[PDB]
Design a protein around this ligand. Structure first.
Ligand SMILES: *C(=O)[C@@H]([C@@H]1NC(C(=O)O)=C(S[C@@H]2CN[C@H](C(=O)Nc3cccc(C(=O)O)c3)C2)[C@@H]1C)[C@@H](C)O
Ligand SMILES: *C(=O)[C@@H]([C@@H]1NC(C(=O)O)=C(S[C@@H]2CN[C@H](C(=O)Nc3cccc(C(=O)O)c3)C2)[C@@H]1C)[C@@H](C)O
Ligand SMILES: [Mg+2]
Ligand SMILES: [Mg+2]
Lengths: 245, 245
């Protein structure tokens, strides 16, 4: 579609010394607005946002048997305590349980993963770097505009996957529910990288408000975990100034 | 499935002077508890809770084309200024827009409405009283045990309808979302009736918490719109009592 720059939105980045981009699209990706035309199409490691395509692929290949599959913890150390338990698919997405999705990816395997990222037009579609880590430290990259396009297809059930499996993943992604206000969303954080090679933090999703829908994707450069609150506050301020929130 | 009476729950009922029942079922043990086995099996006007089967039937028959159908307000006054606006299916359910569901019912028509309520085993299956009003002043009746059976089937996608259509109605029914706590629910209120033959107020739905699922159905006698808040107050206090929050 078309991407239109709104430089007034940089106010929210400038204040916090943040280098990043917000892409926000009403109704469709036919017309999106952004603070940074160039960065809106610049591609970055997806980190935990990749759990969305991975969940769809796991269901499509039958690796995830169905919506009520329980991912059992084997009792062995996992890198975060909140992952050391049995999880549903929703649970695994919402607590961002990487080892659940690593095992999903291993079972999907390289051939099938490559096939579905091509079907989904997902970023640079580059899965090299290890089947269980390409989206964590490999060569996979996707832009904020491309995240919006992917999530719009998911919203419309237009990905090349069953409608059932798109609906399953959508319910797992609900993060805020009010009578006329529904948010689907997913956070991501690649890590702190370095000073000269920063990590990336993401917030992607969509807002359904009355009869209208808004697709959004935010990323920022980050080299310190203490800046992570900005990954939600900057795009929240912008959507509020648009009267969305 | 089993059911057991827990007299202790009459606590929250006597306190605020209410005649009603709570049924709470843990999916993994296939075990339910209720304060009153007799009233758990008594059958009542479903009122707004019928919007759950009505929505599914509307989708199954194609009266509702799909999840992105907008129900346009025709500018004719409605009993609630909340309903005087375009609505998505989720919005119609969450705001409980009777006029939208009366029209759905009319388009489904008696023969098809009768068919699905039999397939769904929905209460006494008697839709006599007018195709657009059987569930609110007609003869249709359903018990709290029948509600949790029906909702358990919906959760499991085991109703005799498309998986897709069940998934659509399920997301429409989400009312609270946290990373490991997801609530689907629907309220109902038939009116004040008489103080001879009161009306009924419902709360039904289910809670997904970690990997457990709890199905619940509440109803109570109500003569005074005044006491509508206790429908949610009493089951919440019971569920809180059971560690479900
Ligand atoms: C996926 O990308 C990755 C996880 N994503 C993120 C993320 O926040 O996007 C984390 S952060 C990690 C999990 N919870 C801890 C935390 O500090 N969260 C935090 C701190 C301050 C603000 C916020 C917020 O407002 O969102 C969150 C540390 C994690 C790397 C994989 C591993 O799941
Ligand atoms: C459906 O049965 C019927 C509506 N159901 C409800 C209901 O509350 O179950 C009503 S009540 C009507 C709408 N909003 C007003 C109200 O007072 N709501 C209220 C009051 C106290 C507590 C709560 C709560 O915690 O949810 C809500 C009056 C309406 C009869 C219609 C949609 O078909
Ligand atoms: Mg990650
Ligand atoms: Mg650093």
């Amino acid at each position: 579609g078309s991407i239109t720059e709104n430089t007034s939105w940089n106010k929210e980045f400038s204040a916090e010394a943040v280098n990043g981009v917000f892409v926000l699209c009403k109704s469709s990706s036919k017309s999106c607005a952004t603070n940074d035309l160039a960065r809106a199409s610049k591609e970055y490691l997806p980190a935990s946002t990749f759990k969305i395509p991975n969940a769809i692929i796991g269901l499509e290949t039958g690796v995830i048997k169905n919506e009520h599959q329980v991912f059992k913890w084997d009792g062995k150390p996992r890198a975060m305590k909140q992952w050391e338990r049995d999880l549903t698919l929703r649970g695994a997405i919402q607590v961002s349980a990487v080892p659940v999705f690593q095992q999903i990816a291993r079972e999907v395997g390289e051939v099938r993963m490559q096939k579905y990222l091509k079907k989904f037009s997902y970023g640079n579609q580059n899965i090299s770097g290890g089947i269980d880590k390409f989206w964590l430290e490999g060569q996979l990259r996707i832009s904020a505009v491309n995240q919006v396009e992917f999530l719009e297809s998911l919203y419309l059930n237009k990905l090349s996957a069953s409608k059932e499996n798109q609906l399953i993943v959508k319910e797992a992604l609900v993060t805020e529910a009010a009578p006329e206000y529904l948010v689907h969303s997913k956070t991501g954080f690649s890590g702190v990288g370095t000073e000269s090679n920063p990590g990336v933090a993401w917030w992607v999703g969509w807002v359904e408000k009355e009869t209208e829908v808004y697709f959004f994707a935010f990323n920022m450069d980050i080299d310190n975990e203490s800046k992570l609150p900005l990954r939600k506050s900057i795009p929240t301020k912008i959507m509020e100034s648009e009267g969305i929130i």
